[PDB]
Design brief:
The structure is cut from a larger assembly and holds chains A and B. By secondary structure, chain A is an all-alpha fold. In chain A, about 75% of the residues lie in helices and about 0% in strands. The chains are: A mainly alpha, B mainly beta. Bound molecules: neomycin. Chain B binds 5 RNA strands through strand 1, strand 2, helix 1 and helix 2. The PDB classes it as ribosome.
Chain lengths: ~90, ~270
RNA sequence: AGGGUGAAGCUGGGGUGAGACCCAGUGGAGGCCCGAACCGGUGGGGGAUGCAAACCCCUCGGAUGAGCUGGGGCUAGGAG
RNA sequence: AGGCGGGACCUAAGGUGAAGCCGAAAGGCGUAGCCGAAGGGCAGCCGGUUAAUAUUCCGGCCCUUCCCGCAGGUGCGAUGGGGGGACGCUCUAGGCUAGGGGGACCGGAGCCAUGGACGAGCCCGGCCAGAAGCGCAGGGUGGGAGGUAGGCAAAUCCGC
RNA sequence: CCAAGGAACUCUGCAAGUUGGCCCCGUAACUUCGGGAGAAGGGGUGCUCCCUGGGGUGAUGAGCCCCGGGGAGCCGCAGUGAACAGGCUCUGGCGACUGUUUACCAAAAACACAGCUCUCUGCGAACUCGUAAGAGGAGGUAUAGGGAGCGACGCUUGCC
RNA sequence: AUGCGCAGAUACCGGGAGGAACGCCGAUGGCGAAGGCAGCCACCUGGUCCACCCGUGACGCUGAGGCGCGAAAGCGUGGGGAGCAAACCGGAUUAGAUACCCGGGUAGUCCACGCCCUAAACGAUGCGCGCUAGGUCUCUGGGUCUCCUGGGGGCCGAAGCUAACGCG
RNA sequence: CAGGCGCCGAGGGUAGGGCCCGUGACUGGGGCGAAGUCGUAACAAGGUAGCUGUACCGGAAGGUGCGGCUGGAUCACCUCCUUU
């Protein structure tokens, strides 16, 4: 489940600069990761509509933030796109 | 090696409502098996309607375990035969030889199970009643020891263990009744393998039924020259009679039949 | 004989969480659909001591299924 | 007609039937072994010759088992255990003759009748069988060793 | 073979003629969204020469099969040129539809039937033949094997 | 009445089977977009409250359309029915009683996967922010925790709002 | 120049569909004109309170079960407003 450690490690791989204790980068890393192992679970289950739901809202959130990502700058952004994989 | 029930062809003209089933072992049976004559005609006089055939394999299956009462066996795997209401497992006995046996609740290829003098009450092994953990399930079960697996609850998921008394344990049998068998006798552990089958749907009758092998039945079939009942007209007769000089369909058959009182009670009925 | 039809599975592309499910390609199943050999035999017509103790013609239905067919057998006649 | 076929072999349905169960009698039922099939299995083909028959005759080419021997080689040695020959239907890739088809392609007996064309014109044919040696395709799997508490009663063979 | 008229003949358009070969344009109420569609209604094709693409075969170059595609044009009343080859639409009762039969009139309802319900039998089941014997049944074993009235399916099966 | 019992029940004792439910604790109490959600245990999960002020850098509020979500009833196949139980059958009723009562018993009620979205769906009152006395209680996070502070629930409650309640 | 050649289409015909109109025994039905032949839910706990979504049964209003929304009367429990 939620492995804090490795977590921070990637918050790291991403946060271009070691001083990103909360940045678009991370909103990204995080919502992503979560979204994914979470969802995978969703699959082998089929009925937890409540949490499915939340997950929903969440994914929204993340994507939208990215929205802004583009808004100001999608450049570095597309790089992100890249690094990650999502939206292809 | 289980099997799909539901697959149904679709609108391939009136071939409508045709239910498929597919055991996955799909292998063609093995070494131990002859074939049956073309009975329907028999003792050379001829008898009982329907009857027709359609292709030809024909079985030999194990009905008796006390004959190795122990050599673990591992599911050779699944498969079946042009007979039986609920597939089989060709099983492998650790000693080399194998045997076509039941096919209780969805067990598992390679699974080890066996039976005899104390078998683990795990659906799959079999045991002398007595090892009956009262409240459990089996089938195949046989009263009068040695008289082989007597009461082969076909796809008959039905041997419900219901208490004991004397040298006989009580059982709830398909039918909706409770008989008794002296404990030393035996039961295949667990339950059957098929039922949905029982629900299977088949297309253009002629086609299906016949394929089944069976042709027909046609009552008070006009010209009641015989056909017990009336005919030579529309109207359904009255008397209240059936084919070959019959008693309708609401009368006994049993008797002293020392058989009867001897065990079982519940008397013959259900109520779904 | 021959020809059209064009399911299921699958493969890929499409949309959620995965998925439904879609589209497309593959596919090419029984019903079959079209229609000879094959099997039946209305619809009309042609013989009345007719080619004939049940026919010829024009025609017509099925044309993989409860299909058709040669060989070998068992049930039979108050029984089949 | 040793080599085509059928028996000199196999067996299902299926009939018989030593046993056995059974009828007032005559019979009814019947394992086993047997009888019992263009269903199994098995060793040749092509060219030539009679008024007339043929892969049966003749001839060329290719084998078949069984007996006597000899030469080389081995636990050889039942048919009883086993493995094994054995199998739908629908469809269907890949690979070879049959078998179609144009060769003016080579052999040949002839022709324009008729206004014409002798000109890749017509007309006829241009193969079939061949130990195996060999080159296309594929077509049908495991070596061991050991444990080898089943064996499929009796033992290295199968199967765990 | 007909014309003039084109069913009034006629109990019935019985029959017979219409019509029918593939390719493109296009296609109704209803629907178990499989389909009723070969609906239906048009139009096409023959043969010439010209520009233009393709799947064959040892690349691929006299070696062939698919459409090409399009263009200009040729001759008939006429161009699946002859023989194979739908008349059609609307609508109603029954029945589902595949079917078998009625050998000798009775293409077709009836009987099938899939699928409904009642209900019968504990297996040495219950019946069916049998003088026992015995087989059958079922090496099946109550989701199974019989007696049945109905007969997809949809709504629905009330009163004694 | 009734229906069930001397072919012994109704009560008491022991044992058997299974379905459902889940007491006290448990609350005027809690979590959830809503619906609605509870014997404990474990697997995976989501909303969400407080404090350091550390990160980013306004990316945010709204949501026609759609998209997924969910009462109970009922349908679909496949399980299952201990009890309860429209329907049905009785018995009691009045003049009538198809219903209010007692005696019965199906479907359903329950599980899986699919399907209906249904509404006095309620606080009959859309969401998002910020401005205006206090008093009280109760649960919950932080503290110099006679209390204070962020959050969360009922209660009293100036101004004020309304045709009037009553909101506060 | 005449005509010839070419589509062009006003126009009409045959076939088919679409929008709306009228329209048809019988028919589900809708609204009302003081003085009617039946019972009577609902509002007083309207006498099983009701109301509702759903399901099912009935001369009819309606009853019944599933679930729920109070726009449900009387004691018994506690918090909180005032007060002789
Ligand atoms: N049509 C209205 C609907 O049906 C009913 O109304 C109808 C009905 O009640 C009422 O009928 C009433 C009866 O009752 C009452 N018991 C006797 C009375 N004579 C009769 O009157 C009726 O017949 C009269 C004959 N001289 C006419 O004048 C009068 O217009 C007519 N209503 O009149 C309405 C007819 O239109 C419901 N009452 C109402 O609630 C619902 O909305």
């Amino acid at each position: 489940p939620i492995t804090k450690e490795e977590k921070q490690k990637v918050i790291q791989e991403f946060a271009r600069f070691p001083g990103d204790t909360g940045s678009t980068e991370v909103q990204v890393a995080l919502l992503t990761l979560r979204i994914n192992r979470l969802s995978e679970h969703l699959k082998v289950h089929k009925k937890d509509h409540h949490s499915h739901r939340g997950l929903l809202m969440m994914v929204g959130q993340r994507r939208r933030l990215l929205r802004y990502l583009q808004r100001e700058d999608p450049e570095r952004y597309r790089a992100l796109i890249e690094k990650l994989g999502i939206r292809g | 090696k289980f099997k799909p029930y539901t697959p149904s062809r679709r609108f391939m003209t009136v071939a409508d409502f045709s239910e498929i089933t597919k055991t996955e072992p799909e292998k063609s049976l093995v070494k131990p098996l002859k074939k049956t004559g073309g009975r329907n005609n028999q003792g050379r006089i001829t008898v009982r309607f329907r009857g027709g055939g359609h292709k030809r394999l024909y079985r030999i299956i194990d009905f008796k375990r006390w004959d190795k009462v122990g050599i673990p066996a591992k599911v050779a795997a699944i498969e079946y035969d042009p007979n039986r209401s609920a597939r089989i497992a060709l099983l492998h006995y650790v000693d080399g030889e194998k045997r076509y046996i039941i096919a209780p609740d969805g067990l598992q290829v390679g699974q080890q199970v066996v039976a005899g003098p104390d078998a683990p009450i795990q659906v799959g092994n079999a045991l002398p009643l007595r090892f009956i953990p009262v409240g459990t399930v089996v089938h195949a079960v046989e009263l009068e020891p040695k008289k082989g697996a007597k009461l082969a609850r076909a796809a008959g998921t039905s041997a419900q263990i219901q208490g004991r008394e004397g040298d006989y344990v009580i059982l709830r049998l398909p039918s909706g009744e409770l008989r008794k068998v002296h404990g030393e006798c035996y039961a295949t552990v667990g339950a059957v393998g098929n039922a949905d089958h029982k629900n299977i749907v088949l297309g253009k009758a002629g086609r299906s039924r016949w394929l089944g092998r069976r042709p027909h039945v046609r009552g008070a079939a006009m010209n009641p020259v015989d056909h017990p009942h009336g005919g030579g007209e529309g109207r359904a007769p009255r008397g209240r009679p059936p084919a070959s000089p019959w008693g309708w369909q609401t009368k006994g058959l049993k008797t002293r039949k020392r058989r009867k009182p001897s065990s079982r009670f519940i008397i013959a009925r259900r109520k779904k």
